[PDB]
Design a protein around this ligand. Structure first.
Ligand SMILES: C[C@H](O)[C@H](O)[C@H]1CNc2nc(N)[nH]c(=O)c2N1
Ligand SMILES: C[C@H](O)[C@H](O)[C@H]1CNc2nc(N)[nH]c(=O)c2N1
Ligand SMILES: N[C@@H](Cc1cccs1)C(=O)O
Ligand SMILES: N[C@@H](Cc1cccs1)C(=O)O
Ligand SMILES: [Fe+2]
Ligand SMILES: [Fe+2]
Lengths: 309, 309
């Protein structure tokens, strides 16, 4: 039988409050969680996402000095690294976000403003969530050009890296490429292919997604650049990914798909795509092979899924 | 040279206040205009359309007893006539408007509510206008699935017919079919083909549009039905169009396009299409022949026109 999947953009709210985590709460290496004050702060952002409903404007928040300081350190350090570490596509867009989306070190962008901006670029919109969603739900959202985004920020004691998708990751790692026409169409396409697919294919798609969209590397000309959202939001792992420490292998879905990866530490291995474009094509081609007893058609005017066959 | 045309949905506001008329103001047969109280009332609706801007919610209005009485007479009389005079497609949709869009004789629907409804059906939205727009501007709007709609109602002394596109015409004549998926795509398609086209083709398209979408007749089975918006909002002309008075000829674009028509009286001649579907196909096929030094592509996610070639 086919698992239930959203057919309308409003139906996304059904799983909006089903949050997970990478299981680092009990990690002595990430004391952030244990922080009682930080926990209460996190609870506030969670309540906003829980009470939020489709179509409503994303509530604006006033960040604390510790949080603004963290964003400042993260933003400034990454902007410096992008010049020599980020792929061409990313660097060509980033300037636009800074000028038309308020991306600056002395100001944490409000999701409502970012969402309005994205809508004008590619039709993508933000949907605040309490935290990490399952791969099926996240991918399913992309089918409607909806990016479930967190609003809280990583603990200030370790800005260099966090084993959770905080606002820095969502905005500096994902948002930029979601504002790109081609990447946006690519994203929606894989999301559409995931709707109602068996979990063994969802998890396989998730692993491929992990080694490309999240932590992929690609060569442009005779150099190697990072294009994975997870690398672009971690100045700690961004430095490491192009260093002599990690192991590098050519992108090959057949092998990449069955490869294991870590979710609480820097990746010990990365896959290098022949180019940013080839990465998109490979992932796109694999998603199209995902079997299901039907076909789907998205109507952008009504924002509804049409199940055929 | 190519005439200027909107490339964004916001750019539509450029010509929103360029109003025209069918020149009946000096008509002794339409004393409505001359009415000073009616004129002041009309001025109120005009100011709302003038100050209105893209994206804003359409202002709600409280109608006068004379106006509500007029809507009641028009609605009730037409609903009775539709049973035997309107085409199948129209009658299948009308019930939905009554149940989910508040279409009743004791209540003039607010455009904001109608627009929200249309958006869920086919992505069409309403844009309040002070009155009649040029064919180029009206058609251009359809390219963005935008229907420039009036908010005022015809003078109460003659509910049976009016030589102007009042709210009864917009809501009972146009809205129903704009809520139909196929008709909506058809409408946007002709609008896209009209963008930046030479006026000799625009006026020809307008004449064809007049004898089909506005006053077309079509046979379904062994009977003849009306599907033209202008017939479906005039209980006076709706009775006449299927009577022995008017002249009827088969729909033939080559002849229909060069045919003359009246704009202040019942049509002396109507064209009968082989079927409602054949009418759409014929008009669709003609619009595709409209020559221009470029091609257009509409991006529904960004609501922008892309000029190619
Ligand atoms: C699809 C893949 O699992 C990817 O890592 C997803 C999972 N869930 C997520 N959930 C939220 N809120 N934000 C993200 O960036 C992600 N990443
Ligand atoms: C396209 C053709 O000219 C058609 O009669 C248009 C013209 N302008 C219009 N303008 C407004 N506001 N409403 C209409 O229904 C129309 N009809
Ligand atoms: N480790 C990333 C965050 C995430 C990457 C992948 C999922 S969450 C960072 O520090 O920004
Ligand atoms: N004569 C129509 C109105 C219009 C038809 C075509 C343009 S305006 C009616 O009385 O409702
Ligand atoms: Fe991510
Ligand atoms: Fe009309």
């Amino acid at each position: 039988t086919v698992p239930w999947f959203p057919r309308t953009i409003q139906e996304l709210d059904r799983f909006a409050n089903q949050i997970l985590s990478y299981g680092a709460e009990l990690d002595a290496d990430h004391p952030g969680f244990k922080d009682p004050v930080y926990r209460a702060r996190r609870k506030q952002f969670a309540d906003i996402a829980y009470n939020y409903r489709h179509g409503q404007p994303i509530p604006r928040v006033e960040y604390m000095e510790e949080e603004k300081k963290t964003w400042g350190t993260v933003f400034k350090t990454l902007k410096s690294l992008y010049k020599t570490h980020a792929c061409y596509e990313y660097n060509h867009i980033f300037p636009l976000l800074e000028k038309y989306c308020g991306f600056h070190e002395d100001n944490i962008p409000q999701l409502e403003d970012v969402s309005q901006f994205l809508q004008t670029c590619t039709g993508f919109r933000l949907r605040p969530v309490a935290g990490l969603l399952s791969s099926r739900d996240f991918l399913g959202g992309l089918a409607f050009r909806v990016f479930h985004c967190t609003q809280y920020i990583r603990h200030g004691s370790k800005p260099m890296y966090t084993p959770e998708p905080d606002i820095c990751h969502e905005l500096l790692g994902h948002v930029p490429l979601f504002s790109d026409r081609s990447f946006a169409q690519f994203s929606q396409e894989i999301g559409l292919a995931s709707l109602g697919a068996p979990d063994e294919y969802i998890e396989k798609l998730a692993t491929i997604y992990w080694f490309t969209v999240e932590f992929g590397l690609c060569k442009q000309g005779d150099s190697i650049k990072a294009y994975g959202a997870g690398l672009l939001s971690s100045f700690g792992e961004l430095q490491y990914c192009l260093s002599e420490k990690p192991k590098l292998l050519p992108l090959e879905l057949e092998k990449t798909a069955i490869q294991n990866y870590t979710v609480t530490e820097f990746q010990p291995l990365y896959y290098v795509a022949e180019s940013f474009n080839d990465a998109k094509e490979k992932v796109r081609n694999f998603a199209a092979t995902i079997p299901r007893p039907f076909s789907v058609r998205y109507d952008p005017y009504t924002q509804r899924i049409e199940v055929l066959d």
